[PDB]
Amino acid sequence: ATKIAFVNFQTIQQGSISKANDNSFIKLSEVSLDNLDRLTSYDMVFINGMGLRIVEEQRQQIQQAADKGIPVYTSMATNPANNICNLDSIQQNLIRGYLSNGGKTNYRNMLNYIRKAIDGKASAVPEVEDPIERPSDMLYHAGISNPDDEQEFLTVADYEKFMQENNLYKEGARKIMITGQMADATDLIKALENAGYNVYPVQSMTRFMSFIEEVQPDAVINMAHGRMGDKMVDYLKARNILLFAPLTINSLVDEWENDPMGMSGGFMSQSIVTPEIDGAIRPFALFAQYEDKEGLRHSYAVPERLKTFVSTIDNYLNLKTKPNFEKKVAIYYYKGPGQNALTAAGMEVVPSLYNLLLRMKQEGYNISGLPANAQELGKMIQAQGAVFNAYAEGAFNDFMQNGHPELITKEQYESWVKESLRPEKYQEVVDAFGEFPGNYMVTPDGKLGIARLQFGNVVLLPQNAAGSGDNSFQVVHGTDMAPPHTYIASYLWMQHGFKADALIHFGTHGSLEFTPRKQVALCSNDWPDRLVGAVPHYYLYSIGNVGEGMMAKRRSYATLQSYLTPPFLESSVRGIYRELMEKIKIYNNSQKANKDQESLAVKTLTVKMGIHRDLGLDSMANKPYTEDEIARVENFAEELATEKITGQLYTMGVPYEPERITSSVYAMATEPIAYSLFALDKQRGKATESAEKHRSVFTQQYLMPARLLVERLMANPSLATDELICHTAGITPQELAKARQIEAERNYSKEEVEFALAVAEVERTIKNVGNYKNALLTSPEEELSSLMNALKGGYTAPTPGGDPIANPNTLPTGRNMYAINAEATPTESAWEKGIALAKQTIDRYKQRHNDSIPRKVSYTLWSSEFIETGGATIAQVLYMLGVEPVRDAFGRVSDLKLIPSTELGRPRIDVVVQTSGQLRDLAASRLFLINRAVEMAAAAKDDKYENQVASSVIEAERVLTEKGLSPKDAREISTFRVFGGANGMYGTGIQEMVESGDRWENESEIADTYLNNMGAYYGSEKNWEVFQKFAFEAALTRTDVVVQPRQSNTWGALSLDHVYEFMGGMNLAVRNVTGKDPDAYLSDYRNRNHMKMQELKEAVGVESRTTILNPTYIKEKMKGGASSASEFAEVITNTYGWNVMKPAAIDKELWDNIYNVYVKDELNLGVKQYFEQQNPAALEEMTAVMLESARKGLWQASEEQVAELSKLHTEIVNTYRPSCSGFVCDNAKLRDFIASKADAQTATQYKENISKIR
Ligand code: HEM
Ligand code: NA
Ligand code: NA
């Protein structure tokens, strides 16, 4: 008897081989990847190398069987290190021939050949035959009489003659081409022909462009495995057609619907990530598997998914033929509660909406009733398009009688639900909110109201709340959140009542793509899939937020359209700190032995301006600063003078001012030139030590000279010649030639590679200075033209992501963004930068703690910084432990190696990681490497230095045993190190609790909530999303440092609300567990040629002195509208949040400065009149936040300051009516505090105004 073993084989192919077997002396068996030690009892071994993932030990077991004398063959290995074979050349060709071609005839001949040739014991076996060869490029179709038989054709003419004989050809019909081999598409082909199309099935792996050009189809459907190429992208742009890409699941239907992930690892990259670079859309799950009577798997298309897919194809193709005068479009925007303004990331929303409607009217769309100008449009939206909170009963009862909403009856709602949703999922809505219509905006008759504003065939709707205002801040484990009736009825009315032809989301970003449950490859139980339906979907997104835009593409099936960012300018604060710089200049040039009188002069001004608080220095009477302390002051002041700030917000269809065009190009080009020249001088061995220690010297030698060069090239772009490049860099012409040659090979010693990269940065920047100015002027026009083309069924070209300063390749805008492949991270470049940043973290800690190293470091991982840096934050985590990645021949990281203790030169340091929901979708396999590396380092024995990773495991186990856990459980849980949100939610849920000031008393209540909401475990696939009590707490012991990444030039620590939600929350939780406040650092990725670590309190001082206390910044913002005024209230709210999380980072003098500017008008700018005419609701929020800090004790304000704030607050409310946000209309204790500080007559009038809305 002959025994043959199969390893890591696919279920479908393995079953086919076993069926084709007919000899009674051939036995087939399967061996798992953990049973490789049984291979010595077999006569032949087959190994599937397609996507195999093994370790060195597993590889060694296979290698030993080959040297024993066991025949081994590996099929289609992707990693060359796994290619193991010990057969003759003739035998390899024969086995490959049978296997590659396939078919049941080839399979059975293969089994007989093994027993005859390889085994040797001929005995009883029939005659074998040569493998049968199949065409590699052809068109195929199923047999008309016998569908089991398949027809093959070699030319397009042969196929077209076949169709006419069988009456499959329709005159004048549209053509669709199908490519790919991942699944059986017999049902898809037949369903499309019943719809009235001509279908051309093509199976050609290499030369598919020859077939496409002869047919000239109207659409292409690809079952993608990999990327098609750049030749395909050029054809699509020239022909202006679409490309689709459905998905395939290799399991049963029931198994797929119970999996919380869907896809991961290499298979996700081949199916989703890589096709996006070509510009594919609609990653719709269509194919699955089923078992037959005998027990064999087969591939088919799910009948319910097939109906929705064919309907989607019709809708996209009908956009091209339907006249513009009959199309219907729906647009969604995001608005604040009450009387707050419309918001989007760096955009003026209301003027942008008006410009879009004017463009559509010219194109021929049916738009009527449009107001005169954008000011009139804003008033109509407030009157007929507002949203309200749950507690403002008096507010939305008045809207029902003055806003004329859309009324939905019970019969309409139930017919829509029975057609779109599943009975079990709709039952969850009833359990949480009750029967239709609910309680929010309900007429006495029993109907539901929808707020909308319609102009002919175009309707505008606001987006409601996706959750419930239960005011329960702790998440319950095991239950998902369902949207309320109002949220559901809005999207179902669009599909069935309004019958829209297209759907648009206006700005960054909504909340539809963050609803439960599955990550990718959604099913019929997922809300984002059901609420969109079969309607074409378009989404306007900003280029500075690439990380979060991937959720919209992969979960809501959206096509992204990119728009610009606000312009940049200089801070212009150099004149304020000019006197301080002169004192430092004299001190540096003093050659006297005793430089104390000069040192005391510098100290006097530093204390007067309050700078000593930002740098953590002393304010002693007669103690002069040392040499090192003065150097720190000089660098802090020079950083303020060279800071870049954003100006007026961006309006669609309007370019920048001529002055702002000039300054934006200055920001995009000065820095790359200056730092590239600095690197070249350092390598050649020049006197660069002085400039590297002082930033004032660097400005005079590398920054100012580079600014003049940019000025010349802007006026005369024709001077960008090879003579200017060689002379600017100080290199001879022949050296420039070899520099371009190294770039060509990679698209040599380590020194040469570094030299080549610096030269390429200088050359690339100089030759594109003229293009930068032209791209900014023409971008606003291309954004409107690209959107009009999309609404006619055209093609949108792909693009990468990132703000123009970080990545100049993102211009012009109006394109579709994509991401990177996560299986190759951390990259070679990212590994070098991560090592350098990890050494700065240790050095900075030792300076402040007397040469001591930390015991544990904590990290936060975000999606946007992962894509743009290539995984630089993961490199820092691995280097702390002392583990390095291992790469294969194709640059993919799948294994780890331990760094020897002597080479490390220091003790190992333990880590703990928290993640966001967006990151877990992009790179889930990288999280498995991090937790595997922790267990590798904790088992490392015989180290020259101390192993602090092993000490943390012992301490964590002791805590768990004290809490009352089993000895077996305590040992297992003591190694959990990766955590995230509970129930798979995308955030922490802590902003709602912090900003509800009257519902908590101590900070220990907030800490308990944070530990509950972020205590889920995501460190392995087997225990994915498992909650264990006390697991998060035991992992935070002995923590010393908290690290937060930062990569964008558009937001800072005080301007983004997520920063204090994650970084602040971790800081608060550690303080309550260890009893000691840790250090907080920032990883600065903004300058790609110069990365550094910065202290949190120093970064706050820089931002406040340049944005909210800077007269230049304020006057730029006072030229905008309602959206610009809303940013002032957002910064004040984040300052309140930071004071709760980390009290030591916010000084009392910071609150006083804000008071002098916005309550007293110290700078004489007239800020109060600006708010009264643009957005009175933003001024109410600012005064209420400041009064809440005084009540809680966070700010030690005086009686005069409190009286003035209370007087201003009640005056705005009585004149312009309450806005009713959380602070103004839902804080009972704050209401009483304000009333007692004002006049008795004013108090009564103030109280009655609030009661009219509640
Ligand atoms: C009948 C033909 C093929 C089938 C059924 C197939 C199927 C698969 C599957 C199932 C995986 C993932 C394995 C796993 O996740 O365990 C994979 C990975 C992969 N395949 Fe294919 N494939 C085929 C042909 C090809 C070809 C011709 C190429 C040429 C380059 C290719 C390139 C890749 C790559 C790059 C990966 C990623 C592996 C990794 O990242 O570790 N495949 N393939
Ligand atoms: Na957000
Ligand atoms: Na907030």
TrEMBL record:
Q: Kindly list the positions annotated as binding heme b.
A: 53, 225
Q: Which CDD domains match?
A: CobN_like
Q: Kindly indicate where the leader peptide sits in this chain.
A: none
**Domain of life here?**
Bacteria
Q: Please give the InterPro entries that the UniProt record associates with this protein.
A: CobN/Mg_chltase (IPR003672)
What keywords appear on the UniProt entry? Answer: Heme, Iron, Membrane, Metal-binding, Transmembrane, Transmembrane helix
Report the record's disulfide bonds: 1220-1225
Entries under Pfam families matching the protein: CobN-Mg_chel (PF02514)
Q: Which residues form the CobN/magnesium chelatase domain?
A: 97-1201
PANTHER family, A to Z: AEROBIC COBALTOCHELATASE SUBUNIT COBN, MAGNESIUM-CHELATASE SUBUNIT CHLH, CHLOROPLASTIC
**Can you name this protein?**
Cobaltochelatase subunit CobN
The organism that produces this protein has a lineage beginning with: Bacteria, Pseudomonadati, Bacteroidota, Bacteroidia, Bacteroidales
